[PDB]
């Protein structure tokens, strides 16, 4: 037999990281206006629309 | 960690008016009509969760 001593040591370490970000924006605007006026006058009538 | 953000907005408008005046007679005559309308709508909703 062999006399003596055994000394053992260990360090196991890990690391993991994950990040994700999403952002969206959509804007739609519409405007529509149409105008018309007519007018007529002759002896002896009057029309205005 | 979790994060959620939602915001919605809707705007709508409407405006219309009809003005028609017609008067026919032997003597001088006048007919006038005035109509105008306006609509406005605004909606907003926001949500945030962490």
From Swiss-Prot, chain A:
Highest taxon above the source species: Eukaryota
Transmembrane parts of this sequence: 32-39, 45-49
Location of this chain's protein in the cell: Secreted; Target cell membrane
Maturation and modification: N-glycosylated; contains one or two bound glycans. Not O-glycosylated.
Quaternary context: Heterotrimer of 3 chains: alpha (C8A), beta (C8B) and gamma (C8G); the alpha and gamma chains are disulfide bonded. Component of the membrane attack complex (MAC), composed of complement C5b, C6, C7, C8A, C8B, C8G and multiple copies of the pore-forming subunit C9.
Clinical note on disease: Complement component 8 deficiency, 2: A rare defect of the complement classical pathway associated with susceptibility to severe recurrent infections, predominantly by Neisseria gonorrhoeae or Neisseria meningitidis.
Family, per entry: Belongs to the complement C6/C7/C8/C9 family.
Described function: Component of the membrane attack complex (MAC), a multiprotein complex activated by the complement cascade, which inserts into a target cell membrane and forms a pore, leading to target cell membrane rupture and cell lysis. The MAC is initiated by proteolytic cleavage of C5 into complement C5b in response to the classical, alternative, lectin and GZMK complement pathways. The complement pathways consist in a cascade of proteins that leads to phagocytosis and breakdown of pathogens and signaling that strengthens the adaptive immune system.
Name of the protein: Complement component C8 beta chain
Provenance organism: Homo sapiens
Residues of the full protein shown: 348 to 396 of 591
Curated annotation (Swiss-Prot), chain B:
Location in or out of the cell: Secreted; Target cell membrane
Superkingdom of origin: Eukaryota
Parts of the chain that traverse the membrane: 16-24, 27-34
Subunit structure comment from the entry: Heterotrimer of 3 chains: alpha (C8A), beta (C8B) and gamma (C8G); the alpha and gamma chains are disulfide bonded. Component of the membrane attack complex (MAC), composed of complement C5b, C6, C7, C8A, C8B, C8G and multiple copies of the pore-forming subunit C9.
Disease note: Complement component 8 deficiency, 1: A rare defect of the complement classical pathway associated with susceptibility to severe recurrent infections, predominantly by Neisseria gonorrhoeae or Neisseria meningitidis.
The protein's role, per its UniProt record: Component of the membrane attack complex (MAC), a multiprotein complex activated by the complement cascade, which inserts into a target cell membrane and forms a pore, leading to target cell membrane rupture and cell lysis. The MAC is initiated by proteolytic cleavage of C5 into complement C5b in response to the classical, alternative, lectin and GZMK complement pathways. The complement pathways consist in a cascade of proteins that leads to phagocytosis and breakdown of pathogens and signaling that strengthens the adaptive immune system.
Family assignment from sequence similarity: Belongs to the complement C6/C7/C8/C9 family.
Protein name from the UniProt record: Complement component C8 alpha chain
Protein species of origin: Homo sapiens
Section covered of the full-length record: 233 to 282 of 584
